[PDB]
Design a protein around this ligand. Sequence first.
Ligand SMILES: CCCCCCCCCCCCCC(=O)O
Ligand SMILES: CCCCCCCCCCCCCC(=O)O
Ligand SMILES: CCCCCCCCCCCCCC(=O)O
Ligand SMILES: *[C@@H]1O[C@H](CO)[C@@H](O)[C@H](O)[C@H]1NC(C)=O
Ligand SMILES: *[C@@H]1O[C@H](CO)[C@@H](O)[C@H](O)[C@H]1NC(C)=O
Length: 144
Amino acid sequence: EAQKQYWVCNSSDASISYTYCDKMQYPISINVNPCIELKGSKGLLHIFYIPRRDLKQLYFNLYITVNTMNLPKRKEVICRGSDDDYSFCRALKGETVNTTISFSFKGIKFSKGKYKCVVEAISGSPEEMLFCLEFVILHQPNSN
Ligand SMILES: CCCCCCCCCCCCCC(=O)O
Ligand SMILES: CCCCCCCCCCCCCC(=O)O
Ligand SMILES: CCCCCCCCCCCCCC(=O)O
Ligand SMILES: *[C@@H]1O[C@H](CO)[C@@H](O)[C@H](O)[C@H]1NC(C)=O
Ligand SMILES: *[C@@H]1O[C@H](CO)[C@@H](O)[C@H](O)[C@H]1NC(C)=O
C-alpha cells in the first residue's frame, strides 16, 4: 500500500499537508483555525491525540527545510516545570488529549516555493519517541 498523505488546510497563500515519519505510531488529528498564511497569521490549533506515552517533559526537534535548503536543528520545549504548562502535559499514556492552543505565526516575507518541517516529538523522560510528523507547506502558486 502507498504511503498515506494527510491534508490539514488550504489558506489564501499556503497548502498544508503532512505524512508520518519514522516508525508509525498512534494517529494524531490536527486542525488549524483559520488556516495558516505563510505571510503570518494567528489562530487556534486543535489536537486530538491518544498518546503512546506520558506527555510529561514533551519537546520537539524541528528540522525545517526552505526550498531544499536544510536549516540547523531547532529544539522547542513544550511541557516544562510547574504550572502555566498546558493541561495536556499532565496526560498519561492512553489518556485522550482533546485540546485547543493559541498560536501566532510571524510570517515569512517574500514567501514562495515549498517548505518542510519535520517535528520529532519526544517525551516521557526516560525519553522515547512519541511521534514524528513531516509537514509540507506549499506556497499557493497563484498568490504572493
Ligand atoms: C503537532 C503540530 C506541531 C506544531 C509545530 C509548532 C512549532 C512550535 C513553535 C514554538 C513553540 C514554543 C512555544 C513558545 O514558547 O512560544
Ligand atoms: C500533543 C501535541 C502538542 C502540540 C503542541 C503545539 C504547541 C504550539 C505552540 C504555539 C504557541 C507558542 C508559539 C507562539 O505562537 O508564540
Ligand atoms: C510545523 C509547522 C506546520 C504545522 C501545521 C499547524 C500549524 C501550527 C502553528 C504553529 C505556530 C508556531 C509559530 C511560532 O513558533 O511562533
Ligand atoms: C489546496 O491547494 C493545493 C495546492 O495548491 C491544491 O492542489 C488543491 O486544489 C487545494 N485543495 C483544495 C481542496 O482546494
Ligand atoms: C473533543 O472536544 C470537543 C470539544 O472541544 C468535544 O465536544 C468532543 O466530544 C471531543 N471529542 C471526542 C470524540 O471526545
